[PDB]
Amino acid sequence: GAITVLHCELTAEIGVTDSIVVSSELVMPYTVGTWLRGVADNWSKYSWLSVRYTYIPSCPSSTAGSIHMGFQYDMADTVPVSVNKLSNLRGYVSGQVWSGSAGLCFINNSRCSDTSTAISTTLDVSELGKKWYPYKTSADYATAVGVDVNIATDLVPARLVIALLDGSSSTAVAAGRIYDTYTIQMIEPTASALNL
Amino acid sequence: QAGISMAPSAQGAMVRIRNPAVSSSRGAITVLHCELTAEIGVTDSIVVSSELVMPYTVGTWLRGVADNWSKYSWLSVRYTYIPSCPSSTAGSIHMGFQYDMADTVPVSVNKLSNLRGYVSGQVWSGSAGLCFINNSRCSDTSTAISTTLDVSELGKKWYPYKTSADYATAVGVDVNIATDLVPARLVIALLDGSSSTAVAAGRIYDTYTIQMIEPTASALNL
């Protein structure tokens, strides 16, 4: 009954400016990437076997700026407001917007050489609070969270906080992209139209 | 000697709490400690009280330490009653656990007696449970008024660190939102006393071992 998918897809496009810009992505099928969003909808519940976010650069070596990533686990906790608080989170990694190429091996599965320079981080699936979560659409999530954020705890495993700053322009400059590489188990099918 | 007992005039128990034991394994950090948790007084009518078993409310020290981590798991939680009155004092204490915050709090020792971890005892006894708090070698704990959480049968393993404030708000929307945040609550009942006015009986100490994971600046933790 468990049907397993392994895949790496574009999860977010990154631009860097001269000011801190904190953003976050829920670590659930619907938000992880559009491809998964579409396939996972045909199933009622899932379990993350492995989730790794890897940043791959697209800018010139002359591009100033740094990216910082880390995880949060209680949606009710406040999202880091400074890059300082961010550095306290689990899974913190911080790189420079033009580096990270060695991480490419995580995206195309070829054998990785030295990945100490890859700006990549992974989710601690075993310390998550439950193994089988329900597939949620961001819309429905939003509504729930609107009543009380604590309703999110039963619905989503974690949140990926990203921070970009130290750039040189007041206007966004294309830095790179964050790709997500996951192994997921999907169970109990459903027509997607009913999945909220 | 078998079958004989002598009621003392008063029991004595010298509580001496040792330094908290903290240590980080790989991923998980573990704390072990004891804290005075509640004060107790009896009356002639029954009075039921409850205490949520979550870091924030279990103890004043724990509250501030646990806040630096995102989630936790109880390895062990024990409540022990230590008396502070003479054997001439009337009254009895009763404890037990409830696990669905929406359930009604017991209104009688009869209902109470059916709960998990139920224990009763004269308001003037229980010094035998001292070894649990003091950390000494336990002798005959046969007459101790102490109970413990059935951690393996709890709803889930990892719970999020919550502040009473945020919890209180959640629960205000619907009490069932609590199920996802707190594992259980200790219920305490006292009756069989002689004054219509409360008479100090004793106090309850909490001894726990908790596992904490995934760090976060405290200020962000709600």
Place this chain on the structure above:
Amino acid sequence: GAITVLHCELTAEIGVTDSIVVSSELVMPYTVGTWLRGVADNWSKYSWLSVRYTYIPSCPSSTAGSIHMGFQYDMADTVPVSVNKLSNLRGYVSGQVWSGSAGLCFINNSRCSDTSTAISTTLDVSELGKKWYPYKTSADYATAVGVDVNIATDLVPARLVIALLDGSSSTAVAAGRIYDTYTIQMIEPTASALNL
């Protein structure tokens, strides 16, 4: 130049009521007890080699109530408001107002048998923040502390917080006494009249 005194004297008389009453004593010569207060004044500075507070009972076995003691080290920190907070402090010990007799051996130096029942606690002289403190009169201390409590840090090593409650009367009932047993080193003499 170091002149050493060892002595045990009455430091405080204790009464118990049906409500919590928190009090505190600065762990300095002047407040530790009147005898020491008077002799230590003839010296400019001192160092605590050992300080132990022991409660000895004077009431009937039928006396309800408990005493709780513990130490604080930054005079600026708030004094415990509940017996709960008090139980978090270093050196916490809590006994029942009629017990503690075994502690008598600390007061008259006779060989102690089993002191596990003595309501006694000691000061961690080695973790104090300095070894030689100046002799201060409570008056002068008060003034300093009035400008800013932080001025106390340079003047006093610690504070003994005491809490009495669980009694049976709204009116104080004589429970016992706290005696202090110390070894102190006094240096650099002075006429006492000048010592503030």
Place this chain on the structure above:
Amino acid sequence: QAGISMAPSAQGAMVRIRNPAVSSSRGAITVLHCELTAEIGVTDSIVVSSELVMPYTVGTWLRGVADNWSKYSWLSVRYTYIPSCPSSTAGSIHMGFQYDMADTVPVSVNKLSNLRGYVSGQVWSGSAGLCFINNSRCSDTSTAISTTLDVSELGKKWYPYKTSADYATAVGVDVNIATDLVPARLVIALLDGSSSTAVAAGRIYDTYTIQMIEPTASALNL
């Protein structure tokens, strides 16, 4: 090869902070950790900045953990600069320590150069200090812009945990009241830049080992 150097277009350093190490010995509890401490930017004119080296201000995590203990002692404190700009960026960074809060903050790299622990470096270099933060095995740290506190020469061993608020008030009465509360302050100067407007240069990470003693409920700690 001896005597030859090649300036890169840009240096890269992948920071990855590991789990805090906490453990209780007998009396003392020890923490070891790294936290991002400050953000850096250069201008064409000199700009001096300072950071007190006390738990509250050293790091956002430390701040909340250390608060559960009454006093502390620094076993080690190191500040390491990691760049985030290209080798074409103009600017230099300078660090050093001051120990009497009443002293005037330096107003020039000349005065600054005389301080204890002085270090200078191009605003675009310093990746060699990464091993200090990442905890890797250090290779040639010859070109790292990192400095450390001379803990043995500090004023006293055990300092009280203080909140910036209470500290700020004390210091407001007289700055000399600080001497009794804080061991030293890091001074940071940046100049030699090219814009009148700040240009992001890099950031500073703090790596420390602290000993904490005599527990207290956090709420009481000021």
